[PDB]
Swiss-Prot record:
Source superkingdom: Eukaryota
Annotated gene: ITSN1
Tissue: Isoform 1 is expressed almost exclusively in the brain. Isoform 2 is detected in brain, spleen, lung, liver, heart, skeletal muscle and kidney. Isoform 5 is primarily expressed in brain, spleen, lung and kidney (at protein level). Isoform 1 and isoform 2 are detected in brain. Isoform 2 is ubiquitous in adult and fetal tissues with high expression in skeletal muscle, heart, spleen, ovary, testis and all fetal tissues tested and low expression in thymus, blood, lung, liver and pancreas. Isoform 1 is expressed almost exclusively in the brain, in all brain regions.
Annotated localization: Endomembrane system; Synapse, Synaptosome; Cell projection, Lamellipodium; Cell membrane
DH domain location: 7-336
UniProt domain comment: SH3-3, SH3-4 and SH3-5, but not SH3-1 and SH3-2 domains, bind to dynamin. SH3-1 and SH3-4 bind to ARHGAP31.
Protein name, per record: Intersectin-1
Assembly information from the UniProt record: Interacts (via DH domain) with CDC42. Interacts (via SH3 domain 1) with WASL. Interacts with dynamin, SNAP25 and SNAP23. Interacts with clathrin-associated proteins and other components of the endocytic machinery, such as SPIN90, EPS15, EPN1, EPN2, STON2, FCHO1, FCHO2 and DAB2. Interacts (via SH3 domains) with REPS1 and SGIP1. Interacts with ARHGAP31. Interacts with ADAM15. Interacts with PRRT2. Interacts (via SH3 domain 4) with FCHSD2 (via SH3 domain 2). Interacts (via SH3 domain 1) with DENND2B. Interacts (via SH3 domains) with CBL. Isoform 2: Interacts with CBL and DNM1. (Microbial infection) Interacts with vaccinia virus protein A36.
Lineage: Eukaryota, Metazoa, Chordata, Craniata, Vertebrata
Gene source species: Homo sapiens (Human)
Function: Adapter protein that provides a link between the endocytic membrane traffic and the actin assembly machinery. Acts as a guanine nucleotide exchange factor (GEF) for CDC42, and thereby stimulates actin nucleation mediated by WASL and the ARP2/3 complex. Plays a role in the assembly and maturation of clathrin-coated vesicles. Recruits FCHSD2 to clathrin-coated pits. Involved in endocytosis of activated EGFR, and probably also other growth factor receptors.
Domain PH per the UniProt entry, residue ranges: 375-467
Amino acid sequence: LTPTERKRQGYIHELIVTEENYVNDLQLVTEIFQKPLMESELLTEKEVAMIFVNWKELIMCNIKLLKALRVRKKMSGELATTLERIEKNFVITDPRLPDNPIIFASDSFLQLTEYSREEILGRNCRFLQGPETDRATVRKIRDAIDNQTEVTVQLINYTKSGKKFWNLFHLQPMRDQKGDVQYFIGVQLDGTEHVRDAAEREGVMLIKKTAENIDEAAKELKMPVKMIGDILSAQLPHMQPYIRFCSRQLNGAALIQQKTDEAPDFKEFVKRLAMDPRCKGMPLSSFILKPMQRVTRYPLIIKNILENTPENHPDHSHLKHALEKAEELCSQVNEGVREKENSDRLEWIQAHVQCEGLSEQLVFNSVTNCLGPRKFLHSGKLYKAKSNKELYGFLFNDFLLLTQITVFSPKSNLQYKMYKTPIFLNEVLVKLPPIFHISHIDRVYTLRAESINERTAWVQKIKAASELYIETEKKK
Ligand SMILES: Cc1cc2nc3c(=O)[nH]c(=O)nc-3n(C[C@H](O)[C@H](O)[C@H](O)COP(=O)(O)O)c2cc1C
C-alpha cells in the first residue's frame, strides 16, 4: 500500500489505542481515588468536589466516544485484559508510522527495562541497544523488518540504568486478510548468558508461541479502518464538560498540595491509593493533568489522519468538520483557563445560589447556548418597583439571574435562593424613563438599582450582551 494510505491507518489506530489508555486512566481515578476519598471521611463533600469537579462527566463523554470507536472497529473491551494476561516481555510497533513507534509495552517489559510507559510509547526500540551490542545482529533485524518477515536472534540490550542482559529476541509481522503488515510483534527473553543447543531451542519455542498469542489478542486491532471521521464529528461537539474541568484544574491541584502540607493523615492515605499497580507509581496530582493533555492531543491526531486522506475519499469531509470541532473545543478550553477570575465567580455562584425546580440542573461555569463559555458581567441589589422587594441579581452574557438573599470572598458564606426563571437576553429590550426598565415580551419588569451609577451599569451591560446575542443568533 501507498505510504499515504499506510500512515492513514496508523493514525486512525493512534486515535483508538490512545483513547483506550486515556479512558482507562479516567476510570482508574474514579475507582481507586475518588470513591475511596469520599468514604474515607478525611475531607468534606465540598473539598472533594473542588478537585475532581465534573470528572464523572468527563468519563461519560469519552466512554460514549470509545464505544462508538469500538463498534466501528468491531472491538470489545477485552484487548487490555487479554494482553495483560500474557505475562511475557513484549512490545507492539507500528511500521505504518514514521520510525516504527511503540504503541504498547507489556508490564514485564517495562519492569525489565526499568523504563516507564510515558518514556516508551511513540519511540523506536533502539534505546535498548548499547556499546557491547553486535551491530551485525541489529542489521539482521532491520532486514527482516524491511522484507516484512519474522526473525529470531540474540543480542545484548541495556536497561535504563545501563544493566546488561542477553536478549533472545523474536520479531513477527501482523498481517490482515489481504496480507498487509499492520503491526510488528517483538518478544524478548531476558537472560544472563548466550543460550545454545537445548537452551536456545526451548527459548525460541516459548517466544514464538508468545507472539502467536499476541496476534490472537490483537486480532480485533489489526483489521483496517474505512471511516473514522463521522464518529469524531458527532462526538466532539459533546466534549463540553472539558471546559469546566480545565478551568478549575488549577485550583483543584492547589487544593491537593495545600491539604497535604497541613494534614499528615491525608498525605499517607493518598499514597496508599497510588500503590495500585495500575497507577504505575504516579501520584494523583499527575492524573489531573491528563484531561488538559487529551483535548490538545485531538487536533494533532485528527490532522494527521486528515493529511493522509485524499479529497475523493468519503471520510475526508467528516475529518474536516472533526478538525474544526476539535479546534473549537480546544479554543473554548484555553479561554476558560485564561479567564481565571471569571471562573472563580461562576463556581462561587454555583455553590451559594440554590437553583431548583428546573428541567435541567443549572451549571454556571459551563457553555452557553450560542455565545460559548459563560461570562459573569454584573451583580448587585435590585428593587422591583411597586413591590420594593429585596432581590439580588446576577448578570451573565447569556441571561440574567434574579435571586433573593436569605460578595465574591471565599471565606464569607451567605445563601442565595433563586427567585424566578432565568431571563435570557435573546428576548429583552432596555430603555430609560436609579430606576431602569427592561422589556420582556411576556412580562414587564421595572427594577430600581442602588444608585444612578448602578442603573447605568445595568442598562449598558444588559443591552451590550443582548445585541451580541441577537446578532449571533442571526448568523444561522
Ligand atoms: C516489534 C519490534 C520489537 C523490537 N524489539 C527490539 C529489542 O527488544 N531490542 C533491540 O535491540 N531491537 C528491537 N527492535 C529493533 C529496533 O526497533 C530497530 O528497528 C533495530 O535496532 C534497527 O535499528 P536501525 O533502524 O537504526 O537500523 C524491535 C523492532 C520491532 C519492530
